[PDB]
């Protein structure tokens, strides 16, 4: 296979930005967009509760060459987002998301 490009996995092209690593609270609607960057397939989203129950997410059909995920953290802690692509785990998943920020005291942006 000298000629041609390197074929490993298109899932590696999948990325996530909208998602907020830190800031998501409990009982709050958390949704983001999963960019393919050329990839074309199906995106399966599934969150794992810290208790021991496999929860499900909401991912409508492919639109504008992109997918939208929607799920609410029934409990606190760092959930595990299972993101797969045409039978291929994306680089970085499961995406660890911290649910529940601790109100900390510290100077703000207000210039002094």
UniProtKB/Swiss-Prot annotation:
Filamin repeats by residue range: 8-99
Disease as annotated in the protein's UniProt record: Myopathy, myofibrillar, 5: A form of myofibrillar myopathy, a group of chronic neuromuscular disorders characterized at ultrastructural level by disintegration of the sarcomeric Z disk and myofibrils, and replacement of the normal myofibrillar markings by small dense granules, or larger hyaline masses, or amorphous material. MFM5 is characterized by onset in adulthood, clinical features of a limb-girdle myopathy, and focal myofibrillar destruction. Myopathy, distal, 4: A slowly progressive muscular disorder characterized by distal muscle weakness and atrophy affecting the upper and lower limbs. Onset occurs around the third to fourth decades of life, and patients remain ambulatory even after long disease duration. Muscle biopsy shows non-specific changes with no evidence of rods, necrosis, or inflammation.
Residue range from the parent sequence: 2405 to 2503 of 2725
Name of the protein in question: Filamin-C
Free-text function comment from the UniProt entry: Muscle-specific filamin, which plays a central role in sarcomere assembly and organization. Critical for normal myogenesis, it probably functions as a large actin-cross-linking protein with structural functions at the Z lines in muscle cells. May be involved in reorganizing the actin cytoskeleton in response to signaling events.
Subcellular location: Cytoplasm; Membrane; Cytoplasm, Cytoskeleton; Cytoplasm, Myofibril, Sarcomere, Z line
More details: Silenced in MKN28 and MKN74 gastric cancer cell lines due to aberrant methylation of the gene.
GN (gene name): FLNC
Subunit structure: Homodimer; the filamin repeat 24 and the second hinge domain are important for dimer formation. Interacts with FLNB, INPPL1, ITGB1A, KCND2, MYOT, MYOZ1 and MYOZ3. Interacts with sarcoglycans SGCD and SGCG. Interacts (via filament repeats 17-18, 20-21 and 24) with USP25 (isoform USP25m only). Interacts with FBLIM1. Interacts with XIRP1; this interaction is mediated by filamin 20 repeat. Interacts with KY. Interacts with IGFN1. Interacts with MICALL2. Interacts with ANK3. Interacts with SYNPO2.
Membrane-spanning residues: none
Family statement drawn from the similarity comment of this UniProt entry: Belongs to the filamin family.
Organism whose genome encodes this protein: Homo sapiens
Modifications after synthesis and translation: Ubiquitinated by FBXL22, leading to proteasomal degradation.
Expression across tissues: Highly expressed in striated muscles. Weakly expressed in thyroid, fetal brain, fetal lung, retina, spinal cord and bone marrow. Not expressed in testis, pancreas, adrenal gland, placenta, liver and kidney.
């Amino acid at each position: 296979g000298s000629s041609g490009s390197s074929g490993s996995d298109d899932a590696r092209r999948l990325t996530v930005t909208s998602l907020q690593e830190t800031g998501l609270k409990v009982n709050q609607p958390a949704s983001f967009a999963v960019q393919l960057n050329g990839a074309r397939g199906v995106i399966d989203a599934r969150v794992h509760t810290p208790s021991g129950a496999v929860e499900e997410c909401y991912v409508s059909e492919l639109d504008s060459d992109k997918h939208t995920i929607r799920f609410i953290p029934h409990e606190n802690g760092v959930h595990s987002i299972d993101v797969k692509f045409n039978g291929a785990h994306i680089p970085g998943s499961p995406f660890k998301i911290r649910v529940g920020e601790q109100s900390q005291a510290g100077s703000g942006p207000s210039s002094g």
